Symmetry: D2
Subunit: 212 residues, 4 copies
């Protein structure tokens, strides 16, 4: 598409998008155009409003577009075109991406003892309620664990809530400990969001006992 301001909008929270160049109050020659999961191609919204879209997005007195509670289907492109008093046209172009932050990740079914030289199920990490899905990763003594290397293997599962569409992730870690290692290793799991500059979330550690 074209150059846009990129906007990240949390599901369930309001969103206000500015119509650049609009007069501060009516009268206003402005039009919003949106192409989102709610539209077939472009929908035009005007300051007069009306109809079903008044339940979703309305133009404010200052020309900004207001959504009271963003949902997954609002992801897309939002554009404004305004004329000011002198007649200069100004365009605004926004790319809206939506997200939700899951609960703190948790480790369930952790092993209290591990045996060297055979595979052991260390635990299952679980994260509930994210959008977009994001990813789970395992760490040993603070350091990321790379699957399929050093006797490490991981299996993963994704499901979605049938009404909200939010993701639940599960990640099961198996390790084949090498003889001679630290008998009290510290494992942990982290959730990394799909969108950039969002913080990772991490579990409490587990410290199983390894028997040589």
């Amino acid at each position: 598409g074209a150059m846009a301001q990129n906007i990240t909008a949390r599901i369930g929270e309001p969103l206000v998008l500015k119509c650049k160049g609009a007069p501060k109050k009516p009268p206003q020659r402005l039009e919003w155009k949106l192409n989102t999961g709610r539209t077939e191609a472009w929908k035009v919204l005007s300051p007069q409003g009306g109809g079903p879209w008044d339940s979703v997005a309305r133009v404010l007195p200052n020309g900004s577009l207001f959504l009271p509670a963003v949902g997954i289907q609002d992801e897309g492109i939002f554009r404004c075109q305004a004329m000011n008093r002198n007649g200069k046209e100004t365009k605004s172009n926004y790319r809206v991406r939506v997200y939700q932050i899951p609960g703190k990740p948790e480790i369930v079914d952790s092993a209290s003892e591990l045996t060297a030289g055979v595979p052991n199920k260390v635990g299952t990490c679980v994260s509930e309620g994210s959008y977009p899905a994001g990813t789970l990763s395992w760490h040993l003594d603070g350091k990321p664990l790379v699957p399929n290397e050093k006797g490490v293997s991981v299996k993963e599962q994704t499901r979605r809530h049938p009404e909200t569409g939010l993701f639940t992730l599960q990640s099961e870690l198996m390790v084949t400990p090498a003889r001679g290692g630290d008998p009290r290793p510290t494992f942990s799991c982290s959730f990394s969001p799909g969108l950039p500059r969002h913080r990772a979330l991490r579990t409490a550690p587990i410290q199983p006992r390894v028997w040589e």
Copy 2:
């Protein structure tokens, strides 16, 4: 995919899918698997049920799956696997497609007079509330009108309701009537649903006057 029974389910109505070969009442060794717009890949549902899916679909005493009110996101594949008292396993495979019937189509902005040898806007046909979209067509004295032939031209528009996802269609007919024709032609518009074996819906006719 595999061979399945096709099921056509009206939006907002209940749906009961039978689990072939299940015992008539509990105890029952059976399992449903669904891959629909509500799932990431397959979801398994069992007679014990539980969790968020209990708000969407539950297994009945006789083993059938029940949805109290189908939505667009329930389109997809539904399978049951059951063992009877003797141990014969029986599979059921359903492909569920959902639909909604729009209101009666209407013609708006119809012309009361037409002029031979020039293009005239005959009218705009509108249909509100269909799923899947379906199509609009124009008829002259009962016979379908073919666009881009005999001075006929049509333009079309599709919108979706921002909350229900249902389609509204609009179709604008222009005709350049030829000199020497019927001075009182009868036009009408019909809505043809997307799904097979469903009846078309037709507008009342309009009978403009053609001036030579």
Copy 3:
């Protein structure tokens, strides 16, 4: 979206779209904008052309857009905006839908004899190479058969060619003949395209013998 001329384009065939209002030859102030399965949102194409898109769509001397061989990914919206010599702006808006016609449908594995009062597999109808999928239906003595009524049942299967994306459909008919019926019924199968005003295709008939 907005009002558009609806265009149906056969896969593998060229497509020429007119830029209304363009001068007949260069110089030309015109721009094409496309949003199709090949684009992220809108792509702009100009008479100078250039780059990868020259392998897909180019602007002709008269301003029309030319695709030498349409594919599934070309389905979408194509718009032109032109200024003429006087400076009048003219917009063209096209909604392009693509299709392919399958081979003649065929019945395989047909029954030569049927037995009254029990279920019989009449045959399997097969259609290869359609886009969009379209549907298969069974007819008895010219009259459509309605599944789940009068001892009729149908199962269906859809697959896609892994490289071309075209659909193959299969439809298996079972009938439980009622005692006292015509001992030499005539069955046939028809393919109905997904797009409007396209002709149905039908199989040769089969005439099994019914034993009372």
Copy 4:
């Protein structure tokens, strides 16, 4: 879905997926099922093979599935089910995600001089050829720059190649430098891939002059 091994497969490279529990060589009771961008729901592949799928994926002598050159449409789920000599059944479940690494990112149109207290276009960063899209980010003297804070603003653009589907990203940085700052700041841009554990790519720095 179910628990699976995640597989990350580079576009254009071969992929071999193991069928756990298969005999080392024929005879072999095993079957692969795939649901990818090439299939309508599940496709079954067998050691005998045949048809169009032989051009895409084949079962090897040892039972593994081989794709000679992965594409975007091979993203999806791949499962094998095998019985050994004794009759133990073993399942393998793989979730295949595909990727491509773009060329080194580059800054174009960089500013050689900046003026304090007004907005300046620092440069445009460009990355060509990624899958999935990934993201571009700006850094000042090694630290990430956060948009809409401290006189920083960014606009972004995404295009796809019309034949390969690979992404090109562009990111334009504007800064209003504050009076009193470093007169020789160092800016750079980095590409962060969509998939986890893949390395970022970074541009050479630019060091404009700031005029107080």
